[PDB]
């Protein structure tokens, strides 16, 4: 099916507390496999997935050098951003970065992403054409002009279409046992009263992969959002996700409420009735 | 545009070496390379303005490279062995130019020896053209020769009236072994100018041969002159 | 993850066309360079290409063209000069494998002289006051003449090299030989090598 790979980086400045804490992680569509924490003593890109350990010492020696450059490339980058926004050198700020590639069913390139961020706000983003940019503010238009003096687009464009995709199938085909397969959820319902004739009905669905799932509480063929609480998807830590949907009903009307689960791993959308 | 120092160095096996590289200004990257005799350079490491980012694992830990202040680099290799004797290159890049062009320096050739039982300096002499050339060409071809030196680390240059000239100058691309079964070296060079340039006695001619040999820190144990860095010159005047 | 340089040794006549190939692995779109290394000094960059212009015109009359359909970045020069005799390296930087450069196997190129007016001769040059040897000069000979090296232990013969008098546009080959023997004259030095019958000798 459709899968993707993402790379997330985070640099958090700290005045007087040493070099800024740099955290960089590598993400496949919904499974993390590599990480790099600056304050760790190893100072090398450490794996976090079993199937990625096949790559030889050249891979780690390459990925270590490329990201340690990014740490210093972003460390000195903040000292420029403080000048751009005329901030205090004793202030604390955060730098964020993300860019990856999505593919189709048979390995076809689908889309390309590249977006930076400064203190939770966008700074510069590569357009969908991958051959132009979009600066957010006037301070970003300075860097946007640079990165236009150099031909940064066709390097990142050739990367998002190339070594991002060309290296992606190597990751998937190494680990087709764990990534390409989908685990359907384990579904059940609970029952919890609060008064003599009013209770809380919560629909449970546990252990599914990936996280895209739809839950809807319907009453006699009519859906309901009023008096419904739906928490965001939460991870289990092993490679599965969880989500519950809540609805408060008065007593005597429970059998009419229906919980429905729609998920990719299920060939048929589930219909649950208490 | 890179500047390296030194160019030629010679040591006994099992000791440490140290060279410097002063790359271009406003360039924040520095790649070290090792080139064997007549082959593609071998990658060593590269920096980004502060510290070492990648190092070849196929190189032992006794290879030490550091760029502390981000303007110049330092290189240190411990326990010298003949298997490491090669030319070592220093390059710089910008990381902001997308083609990421690397500009290399003049490099530094390393030669390791098990013992300094081979160091002999050259002797220089100049030979004037015969009239048979002038009687047939109206131009004169001069010759400079190197006799019995070791090793093949020389830089030959010519000087007419105190200024280097390159028109009509040819030199052997490689020095030879005077004892091809072992082996002091020898080199040849020629210089050709017109007869009026030659038959005028005022024109000055000097064969400059700067030899890369021992330094002042070296200790000389033989009962002879120390073969230190020397520029052995031999001159000649025009003739009637 | 490989760089292939098929032409490993080339010797052409001066003034002809020139092409050196450099093929990389059919993978991504990497950085491309062509470096020249003179025998003594370091590497001098000729040209580079990543912008998107398949044809690149570089220094020293060298021009290079990029063909992604063939994955080749071949060096070219319309007419090679006499000074281009050096080792030529094509260097790439594999974009995903770090900014480090991957160098090729190396091409050693030499140029023979397209001589116009051959006039072989042998001269015995003047011995200076600081030597005991008489030296000889084989000059103005045709390019394709190969000098058989000396077999007598006390005679040295050199390989040919070329001088160019830039002022008068005159190119001539040269070959020097010398010995310290008293019974040695220049007319009896190149008997080991093949000399043209019309080679002039001093009277």
């Amino acid at each position: 099916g459709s899968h993707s790979m993402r790379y997330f980086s985070t640099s958090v400045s700290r005045p007087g507390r040493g070099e800024p804490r740099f955290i960089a992680v590598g993400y496949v569509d919904d499974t993390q496999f590599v990480r790099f924490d600056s304050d760790a003593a190893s100072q090398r890109m450490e794996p976090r997935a079993p199937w990625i350990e096949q790559e030889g010492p050249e891979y780690w020696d390459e990925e270590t050098g490329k990201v340690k450059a990014h740490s210093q490339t972003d460390r000195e980058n903040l000292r420029i951003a403080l000048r751009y926004y005329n901030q205090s050198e004793a202030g604390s700020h955060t730098l964020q970065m993300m860019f990856g590639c999505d593919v189709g069913s048979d390995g076809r390139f689908l889309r390309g992403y590249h977006q930076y961020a400064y203190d939770g706000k966008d700074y510069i983003a590569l357009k969908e054409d991958l051959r132009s940019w979009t600066a957010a503010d006037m301070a970003a238009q300075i860097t946007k002009r640079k990165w236009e003096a150099a031909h940064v687009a066709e390097q990142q464009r050739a990367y998002l279409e190339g070594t991002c995709v060309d290296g992606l199938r190597r990751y998937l085909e190494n680990g087709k046992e764990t990534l390409q397969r989908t685990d359907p959820p384990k579904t059940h319902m609970t029952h919890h009263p609060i008064s003599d004739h009013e209770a809380t009905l919560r629909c449970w669905a546990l252990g599914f992969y990936p996280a895209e799932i739809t839950l809807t509480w319907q009453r006699d063929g009519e859906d309901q959002t009023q008096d419904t609480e739906l928490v965001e998807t939460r991870p289990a830590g092993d490679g599965t996700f969880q989500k519950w949907a809540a609805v408060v009903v008065p007593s005597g009307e429970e059998q009419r409420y229906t919980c429905h689960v729609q998920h990719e791993g299920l060939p048929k959308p589930l219909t649950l009735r208490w | 545009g890179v500047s390296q120092d030194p160019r030629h160095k010679i040591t006994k096996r099992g000791q440490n070496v140290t060279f410097r590289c002063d790359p271009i200004s406003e360039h924040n990257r520095l790649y070290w390379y090792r080139q064997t005799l007549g082959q593609g350079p071998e990658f060593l490491t590269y920096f980004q303005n502060e510290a070492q980012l990648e190092k070849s694992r196929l190189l032992s830990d006794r290879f030490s490279a550091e760029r502390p202040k981000g303007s110049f680099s330092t290189l240190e290799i411990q326990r010298t062995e003949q298997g490491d004797s090669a030319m070592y290159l220093c390059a710089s890049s910008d990381r902001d130019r997308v083609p990421e062009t690397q500009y290399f320096g003049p490099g530094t050739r390393l030669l390791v020896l098990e013992d300094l039982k081979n160091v002999f300096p050259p002797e220089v002499a100049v030979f004037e053209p015969s009239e048979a050339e002038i009687s047939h060409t109206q131009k004169a071809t001069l010759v400079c020769l190197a006799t019995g030196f070791y090793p093949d680390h020389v830089e030959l240059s010519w000087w007419v009236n105190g200024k280097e000239v390159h028109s009509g100058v040819c030199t052997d691309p490689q020095p030879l072994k005077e004892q091809p079964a072992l082996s002091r070296y020898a080199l040849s060079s020629r210089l050709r100018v017109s007869a009026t340039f030659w038959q005028n006695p005022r024109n000055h001619f000097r064969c400059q041969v700067q030899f890369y040999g021992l330094s002042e820190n070296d200790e000389w144990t033989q009962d002879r002159a120390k073969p230190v860095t020397q520029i052995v010159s031999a001159e000649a005047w025009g003739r009637a | 993850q490989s760089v292939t340089q098929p032409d490993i040794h080339i010797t052409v006549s001066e003034g002809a066309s020139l092409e050196l190939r450099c093929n990389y692995s059919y993978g991504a779109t990497p950085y491309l360079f062509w470096y020249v290394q003179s025998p003594g000094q370091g590497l001098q960059l000729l040209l580079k290409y990543f912008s998107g212009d398949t044809l690149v015109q570089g220094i020293k009359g060298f021009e290079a063209e990029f063909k992604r359909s063939q994955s080749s970045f071949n060096l070219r020069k319309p007419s090679v000069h006499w000074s281009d005799a050096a080792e030529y390296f094509c260097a790439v930087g594999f974009t995903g494998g770090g900014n480090k450069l991957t160098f090729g196997t190396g091409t050693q190129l030499k140029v023979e002289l397209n001589i116009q007016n051959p006039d072989p001769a042998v001269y015995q040059l003047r011995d200076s006051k600081s030597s005991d040897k008489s030296v000889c000069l084989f000059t103005d000979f045709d390019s394709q003449t190969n000098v058989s090296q000396s077999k007598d232990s006390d005679v040295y013969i050199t390989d040919k090299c070329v001088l160019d008098m830039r002022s008068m546009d005159f190119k001539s080959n040269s070959a020097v030989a010398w010995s310290n023997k008293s019974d040695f004259a220049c007319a009896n030095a190149f008997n080991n090598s093949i000399i043209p019958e019309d080679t002039f000798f001093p009277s």
């Binding site: 420029i80 991002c164 | 990381r95 | -």
Partner: peptide, 8 residues
């Protein structure tokens, strides 16, 4: 694989 990085 982790791609490259350019300063501002």
């Amino acid at each position: 694989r982790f791609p490259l990085t350019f300063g501002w």
